[PDB]
Amino acid sequence: QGVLGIKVKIMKDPSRNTSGPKALPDAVTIIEPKEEEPVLEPSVKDYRPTE
Amino acid sequence: SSNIMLVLRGTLEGHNGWVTSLSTSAAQPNLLVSGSRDKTLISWRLTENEQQFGVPVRSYKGHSHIVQDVVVSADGNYAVSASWDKTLRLWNLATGNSEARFVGHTGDVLSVAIDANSSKIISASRDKTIRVWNTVGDCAYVLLGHTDWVTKVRVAPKNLEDVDDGRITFVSAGMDKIVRSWSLNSYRIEADFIGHNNYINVVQPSPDGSLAASAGKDGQIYVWNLKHKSAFMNFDAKDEVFALAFSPSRFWLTAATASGIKIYDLENEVLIDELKPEFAGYTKAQDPHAVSLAWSADGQTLFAGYTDNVIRVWQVMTAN
Secondary structure (H helix, E strand, O other): OOOOOOOOOOOOOHHHOOOOOOOOOOOOOOOOOOOOOOOOOOOOOOOOOOO | OOOOOEEEEEEEOOOOOOEEEEEOOOOOOOEEEEEEOOOOEEEEEEOOOOOOOEEEEEEEOOOOOOEEEEEEOOOOOEEEEEEOOOEEEEEEOOOOOEEEEEEOOOOOEEEEEEOOOOOEEEEEEOOOOEEEEEOOOOEEEEEOOOOOOEEEEEEOOOOOOOOOOOOEEEEEEEOOOOEEEEEEOOOEEEEEEOOOOOOEEEEEEOOOOOEEEEEEOOOEEEEEEOOOOEEEEEEEOOOOOOOEEEOOOOOEEEEEOOOOEEEEEOOOOEEEEEEOOOOOOOOOOOOOOEEEEEEOOOOOEEEEEEOOOOEEEEEEOOOO
């Protein structure tokens, strides 16, 4: 009875989109900081001197 | 004892960024090379005539980004500039042209150090590495060991070590919250120093070369022995100590706190004087603090480079 028009759109996974940027322009990733211990006050750890 | 007063005698205007670093040569007492955020070095000739203590001589353009640390040579005729464009520049203090362009740091360089002699250039950069160069421009050594940015590296002067050793000892520190000692000929590690709660902003060996003074974010200033490898003392500044400097004549530590400039008398373990210039039209919460400190060769004048694009000199005027 006529013609049907088909439009298909797929937004791929940006992380898997090789050969280009790997995220959206406004996608911001923040690295989680590492946790450390501060209590060691004097801590003069001498190494073997070299000359 | 030692009722010593220091009074601001001149202001060295002419820069356009924060005067990040200062340097002075022992041989030439009337020359002062200062680098600022305006990507330029300025050489100042000091005049003892009236209000202004100095006179700019030459501006050293050629740096694309922030100029962080400045070091003059021992003879007083050459100056090495570290900038935020990942490059180092060697300048003739009279010609005004650059001699060598040290390249190789993947992060912008934060500090540079001159050898005791005119042999080696020591540079610290944000790429967690230290680089040892010749005077020609090539990089001889790539010292690793720091897991974070290295903010400051200034050499421990050999005073009377046995006679002579031909060994070059210096210190390094940064956002690794550690202070490291290095020895060069070969060109390997030395003892460690771990005292800082926060990260180190600046370190500085004493003029003799046996005391190392380190400072950080928490204002916890530490003084250590290098030849003895032990702590010497510890103070708190309770503000942001941006830079610090020993003094040649007196046994003193100038510290550039976020509020003003403290001076610590080391033999008495007590601060003696506080330096806060008088500005106008501010709100007392953003007064321009100090980022560069440098004493004179004799120990009579102090140069402080602030964040208002100004060098201010405090001359020691003992009012009995």
